[model samples]
Target chain A: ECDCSSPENPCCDAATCKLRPGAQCGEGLCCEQCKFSRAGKICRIARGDDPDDRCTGQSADCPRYH
Target chain B: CDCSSPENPCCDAATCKLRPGAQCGEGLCCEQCKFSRAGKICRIARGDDPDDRCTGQSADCPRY
Candidate 1:
């Protein structure tokens, strides 16, 4: 089935999990908020050396492999 | 909010570890045909002996 995504208020904080369903993410952990371009919901990483490795749009990408 | 529902078929079939999606339901897992001579899909079986659950008559009462 197709994911029923809708426009949402972009998260305005870091350290906060992705819309209550994920970890915080982005540059300096202070950049743009993570968005659900494909999947249902997900957490993004914050400012750090580690690159954000969260699902952006589709759900079929995670749990199955990573 | 109102338009959106976790109740609907939203969860990923693969990501979830065989859950009915949080006390709501799992995605469709059609029963294999038991006997070709009498049936097409093993649609239903007795509730008491769910292993024999049969629903040739709206027994699968599904809800969105």
Candidate 2:
């Protein structure tokens, strides 16, 4: 289980504990505005952050991991 | 105005309180709890609007 209260944990947010009309539970390269990015959408960028990150212009539907 | 923070006032007539990390207004596609689908036609072309458009099935891509 992930800790919703800890800001350090990117998996969840404290505000997600309450049921609201617009509560976000998670965020990530694939997650956007509480929803998953659509297929054919660019989910990651390369040569800037993690070497394992996907290349720029790579579609979310086709993720290339090393 | 910071819509993400409950302390600030919202630009529109909506509840000021928003979930943390959730964004609102400012020409963004993000709505109350979720984001608009890519190429959902957010803003209409108008004077000074610059005909801003969303990517095709992609959120991070540069708008057309």
Candidate 3:
């Protein structure tokens, strides 16, 4: 089992253990202001996995598949 | 303010200050008083975000 309350896993409230509203997580590369970054927004830099990542075309997170 | 000292490394240093309209320390992608090209590597993920679901190679960066 995982600790949803931890800051590393912030999709759920520590006290309530419930999913946060309109938020994938409290903080993320593609997340800003508690919501997914706007489409085309650069969210992540290039690394071993791939080139820089960007928000989808629909105001969604950078790795839409993720 | 005195910005001639290298130890200070102020964005408004005498060198950059002499160059009209140059920027520094404005963002993670900005380096050497110039903005990095779009899609260029700027940051590495902490590999601690739960959203990554255990894939430690996740990354983060700024917009173009």
Candidate 1 recovers what fraction of true contacts? Answer: 0.00
Cα lDDT tens digits, model 2, A1-66, are 232335554444445542123423343455454444554454445444533333223122223332
- The best-first sequence of candidates by lDDT reads 3, 2, 1
Instruction: Report the error of model 2 at residue B45, Å.
Output: 3.5
State the lDDT of candidate 3 residue by residue for A1-66, as single tens digits.
Answer: 221336455666656654465554344455665455666677756545644656643222244122
Candidate 1 residue spans exceeding 4 A from truth: A1-36, A39-43, A60-66, B1-64
In model 3, the runs with Cα more than 4 Å from the true position are A1-11, A46-51, A57-66, B1-64
Return whichever of 1 and 3 wins on DockQ: 1
Give the Å shift of residue B22 in candidate 2: 5.5
**TM-score to native of every candidate shown:** 0.15, 0.25, 0.31
Q: What is the lDDT of residue A28 in candidate 3?
A: 48
- Count of backbone clashes, every candidate in sequence: 20, 0, 4
Output per-candidate TM-scores for chain A, rounded to 2 decimals. 0.20, 0.36, 0.46
Full ranking by TM-score: 3, 2, 1
Q: Look at candidate 1 and tell me the lDDT of residue A64.
A: 15
What is the TM-score (0 to 1) of chain A in model 1? 0.20
Give the number of the best model, judged by DockQ.
1
Query: Residue B49 of candidate 1: its Cα lDDT?
Result: 29
Error of 1 at A58 (Å): 2.6
